Paper text:
Imaging of purified samples of full‐length native UMOD (UMODfl) showed that the majority of filaments had a tree‐like structure, resulting from the regular alternation of ~12 nm‐long branches protruding at an angle of 50 to 60 degrees from either side of the polymeric core; other filaments instead adopted a zig‐zag shape consistent with early negative stain EM studies of UMOD. In agreement with the observation that the two types of structures occasionally interconvert within individual filaments, helical reconstruction of UMODfl showed that these apparently distinct conformations in fact correspond to different views of a single type of filament with 62.5 Å axial rise and 180° twist. The map is fitted with an atomic model that consists of a complete EGF IV + ZP module (chain A; blue), the ZP‐C domain of a second molecule (chain B; teal), and the EGF IV + ZP‐N domain of a third one (chain C; magenta). Lower map resolution outside the filament core and lack of close structural homologues precluded accurate modeling of D8C. However, different ab initio prediction programs suggested that—consistent with the expected presence of multiple intramolecular disulfides —this domain adopts a compact fold with average dimensions that closely match the globular density protruding from EGF IV. Considering the previous placement of D8C, this local map at moderate resolution agrees with the dimensions of a homology model of EGF I‐III. By combining this information with the refined coordinates of EGF IV + ZP, we could assemble a complete filament model consistent with both the tree and zig‐zag views of UMODfl.
Residue numbers in the entry:
A (entry chain B): 444 to 587
B (entry chain A): 292 to 587
C (entry chain C): 292 to 444
The structure:
Amino acid sequence: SALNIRVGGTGMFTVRMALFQTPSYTQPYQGSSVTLSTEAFLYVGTMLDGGDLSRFALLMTNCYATPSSNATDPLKYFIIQDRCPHTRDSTIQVVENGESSQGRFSVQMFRFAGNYDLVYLHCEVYLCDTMNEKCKPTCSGTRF
Amino acid sequence: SVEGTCEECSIDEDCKSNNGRWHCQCKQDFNITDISLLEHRLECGANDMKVSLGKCQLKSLGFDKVFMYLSDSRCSGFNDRDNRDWVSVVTPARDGPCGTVLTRNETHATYSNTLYLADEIIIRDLNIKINFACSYPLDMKVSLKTALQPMVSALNIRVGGTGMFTVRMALFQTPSYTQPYQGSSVTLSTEAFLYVGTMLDGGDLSRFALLMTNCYATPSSNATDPLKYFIIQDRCPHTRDSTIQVVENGESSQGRFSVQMFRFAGNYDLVYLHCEVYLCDTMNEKCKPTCSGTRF
Amino acid sequence: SVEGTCEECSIDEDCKSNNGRWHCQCKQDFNITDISLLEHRLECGANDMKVSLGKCQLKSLGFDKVFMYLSDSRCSGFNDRDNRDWVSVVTPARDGPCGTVLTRNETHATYSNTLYLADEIIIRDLNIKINFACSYPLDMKVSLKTALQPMVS
Ligand SMILES: *[C@@H]1O[C@H](CO)[C@@H](O[C@@H]2O[C@H](CO)[C@@H](O[C@@H]3O[C@H](CO[C@H]4O[C@H](CO)[C@@H](O)[C@H](O)[C@@H]4O)[C@@H](O)[C@H](O[C@H]4O[C@H](CO)[C@@H](O[C@@H]5O[C@H](CO)[C@@H](O)[C@H](O)[C@H]5NC(C)=O)[C@H](O)[C@@H]4O[C@@H]4O[C@H](CO)[C@@H](O[C@@H]5O[C@H](CO)[C@H](O)[C@H](O)[C@H]5O)[C@H](O)[C@H]4NC(C)=O)[C@@H]3O)[C@H](O)[C@H]2NC(C)=O)[C@H](O)[C@H]1NC(C)=O
Ligand SMILES: *[C@@H]1O[C@H](CO)[C@@H](O[C@@H]2O[C@H](CO)[C@@H](O[C@@H]3O[C@H](CO[C@H]4O[C@H](CO)[C@@H](O)[C@H](O)[C@@H]4O)[C@@H](O)[C@H](O[C@H]4O[C@H](CO)[C@@H](O[C@@H]5O[C@H](CO)[C@@H](O)[C@H](O)[C@H]5NC(C)=O)[C@H](O)[C@@H]4O[C@@H]4O[C@H](CO)[C@@H](O[C@@H]5O[C@H](CO)[C@H](O)[C@H](O)[C@H]5O)[C@H](O)[C@H]4NC(C)=O)[C@@H]3O)[C@H](O)[C@H]2NC(C)=O)[C@H](O)[C@H]1NC(C)=O
Ligand SMILES: *[C@@H]1O[C@H](CO)[C@@H](O[C@@H]2O[C@H](CO)[C@@H](O)[C@H](O)[C@H]2NC(C)=O)[C@H](O)[C@H]1NC(C)=O
Ligand SMILES: *[C@@H]1O[C@H](CO)[C@@H](O[C@@H]2O[C@H](CO)[C@@H](O)[C@H](O)[C@H]2NC(C)=O)[C@H](O)[C@H]1NC(C)=O
Ligand SMILES: *[C@@H]1O[C@H](CO)[C@@H](O)[C@H](O)[C@H]1NC(C)=O
Ligand SMILES: *[C@@H]1O[C@H](CO)[C@@H](O)[C@H](O)[C@H]1NC(C)=O
């Protein structure tokens, strides 16, 4: 004879992203703010500080910039749109996405038009199981 | 009396200090059996999952020695070593080690594993296995903390534009200031009272008030005429004429002055009305002029 | 040849009528880059202030799409809708709405606000902000138009 009692616990993985300077993705920043020029290339990468399962891959469902820290802002400049980079901008190139836990997107700096002085970066990400999904998105031009 | 005072024993474990008697024992807080069987706590970590039970509860339930096992016996329980009341075990949050499995659906993944409890190696009467699971969301919001302050080469060119507010005044008939006139000319008698008011047809800012710096009448339309009969002199009405009364001036955009009719002395048949006005900012100036008799 | 003749296109926008070819395009009048960057016009209203630029000039400067913003983004540019050549925006002549401020001195008040220009949401090379201001006199002459004809015995 055995007694079974159900127990459940809500949890949360750890996810973070870093701003690298070099094209080799070497040194993260540590200051609360940085200064840059338009010609400077903004190299950024994402990482999992925990749960680095080999079969969980990092897929950028969409990334965007915002003038303010608050993510829910109407003024969004999608840099990655629904698993693919935004076209009509040659400076947007992603070396790796979905291959492994190290997701990096490269783009050169921009400024919001208006009185907005500060620019923030936000992203949404979907962990992909390599067992079932290919997790290597492929795309081309839109409807036209 | 190996230890002189209470600090050796746990804060949760109450210490009975007495002459000739010393020990620390639980209280009603961790006392009962059934709810203790219902008692537990869980913690889902980023890379590990922990389950723990109160050692006092286990001792009260008769389990002087506590044996905690999972689906894989290589995992064994041990003391909390952070808060001594609990006893806890750890499981890496993966599939394959310690017997843990991966339950996945479209929304978010989940990890499930079982905890086995017993007083000894063998189980005689009851075999309670605690089935626990942690849910890890598969979609989550992430924000880059470090903001950016880009630099751009901007061109500044100055531009200026001369403008003009709109100002007008009206001749009302009634003391209530109700109907303006529309004809190019009017006819009146001396006994008739001439009620007039001024208005801003635009720019009705709440902090801009209307102040009559001076008002005067002229026999002709041309303002620059030597023959002026000042009705309001330097922000105040002209004295020595009881018929000159102003209900409001500087209070708001509606400036009204009341005076009964007059005629210029001479061949002058027509009389005109002109005024000068200063818009007053309520933030700084009181804009409520006050005055009395002159030098004497 | 959807439209038979020239009247559809703007008077300022010259219409090229030809057999087998039809369109309307600008001329030397609105052609150059630098002076066009120097080109503008302003209008100070009783209760509103307007700034506008020639749409042809913007098209010639490569800004196929025109984004006009002020110190407050709730204010957005739009077509003139009176003379189609211009594109203009409006600002109420007060302090607080649309980010406008009030600069005041003893002689007369002044209103200052900034206009931001760009081809898209982001700015890459040049960020030109047009600083404009209107001066409203604080003392002015007012004359009652309707004269009077009093009667006396
Ligand atoms: C992908 O996968 C994920 C998970 O991996 C899915 O998301 C998960 O879905 C489950 C199921 O909905 C979620 O669990 C549920 O949580 C409920 C509470 O959630 C809130 O409170 C939490 C408190 O900590 C909080 O953390 C959380 O964030 C929420 O805010 C919980 O109430 C649910 O329990 C009910 O359902 C259980 C399973 O059916 C049931 O267990 C069984 O119960 C019977 C009954 O005795 C027992 O015999 C069985 O032994 C036992 N175990 C089994 C079957 O295995 C519970 O008992 C409980 O049953 C319902 O619960 C109702 C309320 O929840 C009660 O409603 C009351 O009813 C009264 C009348 O009877 C009155 O009308 C009263 O007004 C009314 O409120 C019922 O009474 C009661 N039954 C009975 C008979 O009384 C459940 O555990 C889980 O949280 C969620 N994941 C996350 C992260 O949140 C996702 O959907 C999947 N997606 C896809 C696409 O597949
Ligand atoms: C209360 O507040 C009100 C306003 O709110 C005050 O009244 C206002 O005062 C200002 C200042 O005087 C007035 O603006 C001035 O208008 C001048 C023209 O005005 C007439 O023409 C207008 C044309 O439309 C017309 O509408 C108007 O009614 C008048 O008829 C204008 O010329 C003035 O510009 C000079 O000053 C600018 C500010 O210093 C300066 O801007 C800077 O310039 C430098 C130089 O390159 C640049 O680097 C800066 O980026 C730029 N911007 C800044 C500093 O912010 C202009 O460039 C310009 O500079 C002078 O201008 C002189 C003539 O104005 C030139 O003189 C020539 O010089 C030559 C030698 O160099 C020869 O000698 C030549 O013969 C000679 O003519 C200078 O050359 C030039 N500098 C250089 C280096 O070349 C100014 O904008 C405003 O109009 C007025 N308000 C109203 C409603 O009229 C009031 O006073 C306040 N009162 C109190 C009590 O506080
Ligand atoms: C656990 O519960 C028992 C319940 O019996 C507690 O014993 C009671 O202790 C209080 C102390 O003031 C007495 O007044 C009651 O008369 C006792 N109960 C009975 C039935 O006699 C006991 O103290 C609780 N704590 C522990 C550690 O056992
Ligand atoms: C804008 O300026 C250019 C200047 O090149 C104009 O092109 C000239 O057009 C005339 C038309 O008779 C020719 O004679 C010139 O030879 C042209 N210039 C050159 C350098 O070849 C153009 O027409 C102007 N207007 C527009 C709308 O572009
Ligand atoms: C973010 O903005 C939305 C709407 O723009 C608002 O409802 C929400 O409260 C804001 N949150 C923060 C933290 O600013
Ligand atoms: C008004 O009168 C002055 C002098 O009396 C004269 O210089 C001016 O030209 C006159 N203007 C009109 C419009 O009559």
